[PDB]
Amino acid sequence: TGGHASNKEKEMVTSLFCKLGVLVRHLGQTLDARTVMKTGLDSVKSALRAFLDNAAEDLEKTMENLKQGQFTHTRSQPKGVTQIINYTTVALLPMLDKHNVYSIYNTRSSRERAALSLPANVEDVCPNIPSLEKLMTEIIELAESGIRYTQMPYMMEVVLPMLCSYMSRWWEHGPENHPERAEMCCTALNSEHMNTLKIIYNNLGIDEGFSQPIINKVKPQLLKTHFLPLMEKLKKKAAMVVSEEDHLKAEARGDMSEAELLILDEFTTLARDLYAFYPLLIRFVDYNRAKWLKEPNPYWSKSHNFKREEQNFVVQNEINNMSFLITDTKSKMSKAAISDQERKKMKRKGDRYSMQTSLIVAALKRLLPIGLNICAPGDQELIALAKNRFSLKDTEEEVRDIIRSNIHLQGKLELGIANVLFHLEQKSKY
């Protein structure tokens, strides 16, 4: 009965994704499908257990088939938003899959070829002229869930490295975004940007046609050395294009390098220093609007820079408090907007504060009293600001209500953040 219970969750939806794959394209199937695909995947929360430990027969051979059926359905004429079911099966793939036994990646490869260059494929090349069916941010966010190998790759590594190299070359050629309408959040597209996972990849592939050039470590090192000045000189005072360029640079040249990260100690230190200095240059400006960065990615010089930035922000907040103590402003709408912006900026600062709290504590435990001497005015200002506040207190509720996303990184020990959490207790423990 274990095999029956395993296959009843995947073969049923795999077989049912064959009639509406052509009927919708053109009785109650459009109503029972909503129950059907949720019973297929979202009925079991830990579908990875049934994939790996319970029965490996279904595995990718059924998961990729169901995903291809869903992709064909999205290629058809949909009516309602059904992204929850497709997005709730992202981390259930790796936590391998024998892709050589059955290759069900042909449909996804065809879709990726049809959408090889999103800034360049904004035309009627797609069938039936899809205004929002496929030519939108839906497929961009779907590629994040479909392509995810954070734990370990589970593919044949035949088309994935070539596709990654082609996308990297296209992003190197196209510096600007140049996207379509209502497609601002184009950064969250690829979650597997890594080595072997102006380029001469085409020539190398033509010459080989055994070993791809991505296997050798010379090409990723050359690419990193060429991209280092690009992200080193990336500093602009704009609010829209500068923010999108910084997000694109962080996505394309992120810290996710599982190919011997500890071996390249100098490269790791340079990357950490750059990822520490970039938010300092970003927050050097006033940056009244903090909604441009939806979710930014979490030595002595970096600690000193963070302490100086915290002191400057504490001075600015104290000045704002003394300015708002008297000379009452206009109606409560403007005050609520100002308080919400201040709370958003405080949460954005506190995310990095909680991220670096462990490092600060580790540095200060042995012999560093300078960190304590720098953090004492910050704690004093934080205590004074929360000593008597009402407008911030009432706007915090609506700020938390607006931001439904939560990080809760305090419990990891490794509303995005609240006023009092584990980091505050660690700071007050001294």
């Binding site: 219970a5 009843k8 969750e9 049923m12 009785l27 109650g28 199937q29 109503l31 029972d32 909503r34 129950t35 059907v36 949720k38 019973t39 979202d42 009925s43 079991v44 049934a50």
Partner: protein
């Protein structure tokens, strides 16, 4: 399943019998409640 998930017996059969139950009707009705609990939530 917190208290006691000991005996399966008719574990998923009560819902496996009519998981394809919404195939006759076209729309409407209050039978559309949820689908995650289906298939036993995995005289």
């Amino acid at each position: 399943q917190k208290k006691y998930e000991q005996e399966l017996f008719k574990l998923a059969l009560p819902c496996l019998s009519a998981v394809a139950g919404a195939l006759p009707p076209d729309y409407m009705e209050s039978n559309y409640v949820s689908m995650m609990e289906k298939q036993s939530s995995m005289f």
